[PDB]
Motif scaffolding. Structure first.
Motif, mmCIF file in Angstrom:
data_model
loop_
_atom_site.group_PDB
_atom_site.id
_atom_site.type_symbol
_atom_site.label_atom_id
_atom_site.label_comp_id
_atom_site.label_asym_id
_atom_site.label_seq_id
_atom_site.Cartn_x
_atom_site.Cartn_y
_atom_site.Cartn_z
ATOM 1 N N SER A 18 -6.028 2.044 5.900
ATOM 2 C CA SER A 18 -5.286 1.304 4.870
ATOM 3 C C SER A 18 -3.889 0.872 5.342
ATOM 4 N N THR A 19 -3.099 1.820 5.840
ATOM 5 C CA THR A 19 -1.748 1.528 6.331
ATOM 6 C C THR A 19 -1.756 0.562 7.520
ATOM 7 N N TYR A 27 0.817 -1.225 0.000
ATOM 8 C CA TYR A 27 0.000 0.000 0.000
ATOM 9 C C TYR A 27 0.851 1.276 0.000
ATOM 10 N N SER A 28 1.803 1.354 0.929
ATOM 11 C CA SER A 28 2.627 2.557 1.106
ATOM 12 C C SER A 28 3.607 2.816 -0.038
ATOM 13 N N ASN A 55 -4.299 -3.024 5.463
ATOM 14 C CA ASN A 55 -4.131 -3.611 4.110
ATOM 15 C C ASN A 55 -3.166 -4.814 4.041
ATOM 16 N N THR A 108 -2.192 8.505 -2.088
ATOM 17 C CA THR A 108 -3.227 8.593 -1.040
ATOM 18 C C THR A 108 -3.942 9.956 -1.044
ATOM 19 N N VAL A 168 -1.161 14.148 2.813
ATOM 20 C CA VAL A 168 -2.491 13.571 2.603
ATOM 21 C C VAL A 168 -3.546 14.678 2.443
ATOM 22 N N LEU A 170 3.260 9.855 -1.187
ATOM 23 C CA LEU A 170 2.038 9.912 -0.381
ATOM 24 C C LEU A 170 1.062 10.982 -0.875
ATOM 25 N N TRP A 216 -6.363 6.841 4.966
ATOM 26 C CA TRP A 216 -4.920 6.700 5.174
ATOM 27 C C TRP A 216 -4.602 5.860 6.410
#
Ligand SMILES: CCCCCCCCCCO[C@@H]1O[C@H](CO)[C@@H](O[C@H]2O[C@H](CO)[C@@H](O)[C@H](O)[C@H]2O)[C@H](O)[C@H]1O
Ligand SMILES: CCCCCCCCCCO[C@@H]1O[C@H](CO)[C@@H](O[C@H]2O[C@H](CO)[C@@H](O)[C@H](O)[C@H]2O)[C@H](O)[C@H]1O
Ligand SMILES: CCCCCCCCCCO[C@@H]1O[C@H](CO)[C@@H](O[C@H]2O[C@H](CO)[C@@H](O)[C@H](O)[C@H]2O)[C@H](O)[C@H]1O
Ligand SMILES: [F-]
Ligand SMILES: [F-]
Ligand SMILES: [F-]
Ligand SMILES: [F-]
Ligand code: NA
Lengths: 96, 124, 125, 96
Positions: free
Chosen positions: B22-23, A80-81, B26, C71, C8, C67, B19
């Motif tokens: 998910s982190t 994901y990251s 996931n 995201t 974000v 990021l 955010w």
């Protein structure tokens, strides 16, 4: 927290000029594994090739008989990251 | 400008929630990342309840409607992350889970919107 | 966590604002498959695909920029909730042919745009 | 800018005790149309019923012969900003 490095890299079968290797897949979506190999005495160029993410074995051919080789495996994987990135390697030595 | 604040305040809350979830989650199940699924299912539920609720309250401020739908539900849900997850599975030769991810996100998200709408309609 | 939070919010706010402008301006032009909601999902698919290929080749770039683009921007720009109510409304209205078409075009279309983003950058590199 | 109110509401066929009405659909996703009718002299209860979004006609039955009726049509529709809401009505008078 989840490791993207493979584990239990080992030679399951060998001829004088080839090795069949296997490994356990890490708990991440691996797109391809990269296998590197070269003579352990470090005046010899290291070669690499990929294998699909669905596979967890590979054959290395065209080796010289009676020579020590260093064999490493790392992944190109989705997370994901980091999206697509490369893992750290796992390594073993083996004499033909 | 007042409408823009509703979009940004609501959107920032949604994105920040996405955010964190998910982190955190996931990586637990990489074949169908549960953080990305939960945020889409949850946004489907909220938009469905909004669908039924705003019908019954036609004189609410457009500021609150905008902040909940375009802001929160818009920022919380995601189509782009849904795509890369599926794309990555297709590149990795994992077709069974690429298909499963598409069905579960679509069928799941419509089911949650239906529940949101009908729960409020059954109450009212 | 605070520097990551700015990425974000800044990225997400830009995406949401873009989605808000494009949807309100264009969605009403074709109500059977609202074009504002489609374009934002197709565009976000394209950007995430190009990011996929580009960041692989530049592995040591700042996590702030990654990021903010994924995201943040792509997350804020795209939407699954609006995709659902549009389809749900069509199903309630008895318009099954366009409910199906909306699902196929959003899914098949968004994967195709991600593929193009990835392969264009890979073909350049 | 787009109107959710129907246009060209009219009686296309009539008997002494029934009316067939039609209308043009507005350029929005209509979920259902609501038809209301009652005697124009306002000591009579107004009745309503829905018709699916795909339809643009309806039959009204059980009317009295030689009486003025007020007939209205409005929509319950989806839009981006307001989600589900009700439109303003379009209205006509018709004597059986
Ligand atoms: C919008 C259109 C959508 C449909 C497009 C489908 C395209 C699929 C074929 C493209 O060609 C592929 O390119 C890959 C490189 O990009 C190569 O992968 C090789 O390299 C990859 C890493 O770059 C590894 O993951 C693979 O295992 C390895 O086979 C692969 O051989 C080759 O056939
Ligand atoms: C519904 C519409 C969707 C549109 C989008 C389509 C998705 C495009 C992604 C294509 O990615 C390919 O996937 C192959 C696997 O699926 C890979 O093959 C790799 O793995 C295979 C085995 O899994 C080997 O046979 C190949 O040689 C090896 O290149 C290949 O490299 C990779 O580029
Ligand atoms: C696939 C994934 C999961 C999907 C989610 C579940 C489906 C969504 C709910 C559907 O809602 C119903 O749809 C009917 C059909 O559109 C409507 O009937 C209406 O339309 C019918 C067809 O014209 C008429 O026969 C009915 O009388 C009339 O109430 C009905 O009002 C509405 O509540
Ligand atoms: F997308
Ligand atoms: F997914
Ligand atoms: F959703
Ligand atoms: F849609
Ligand atoms: Na979003």
């Amino acid at each position: 927290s989840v490791s993207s490095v493979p584990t239990k890299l080992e030679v399951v079968a060998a001829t004088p000029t080839s090795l069949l290797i296997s490994w356990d897949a890490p708990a991440v979506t691996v797109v391809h594994y990269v296998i590197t190999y070269g003579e352990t005495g470090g005046n010899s160029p290291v070669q690499e090739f990929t294998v699909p993410g669905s596979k967890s074995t590979a054959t290395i051919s065209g080796l010289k008989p009676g020579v020590d080789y260093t064999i490493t495996v790392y992944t190109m994987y989705y997370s994901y990251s980091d999206l697509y990135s490369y893992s750290s390697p796992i390594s073993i030595n083996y004499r033909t | 400008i007042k409408s823009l604040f509703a979009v940004i305040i609501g959107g920032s809350v949604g994105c920040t929630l996405r955010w964190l979830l998910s982190t955190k989650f996931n990586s637990l199940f990489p074949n169908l990342p549960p953080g990305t699924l939960v945020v889409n299912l949850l946004a489907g539920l909220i938009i469905g309840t909004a669908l039924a609720y705003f019908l019954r309250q036609p004189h609410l401020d457009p500021f609150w409607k905008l902040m909940i739908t375009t802001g929160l539900c818009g920022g919380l849900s995601t189509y782009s992350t849904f795509s890369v997850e599926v794309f990555a599975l297709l590149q990795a030769g994992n077709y069974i889970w690429a298909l499963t991810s598409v069905l579960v996100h679509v069928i799941g998200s419509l089911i949650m919107t239906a529940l949101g709408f009908f729960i409020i309609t059954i109450l009212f």
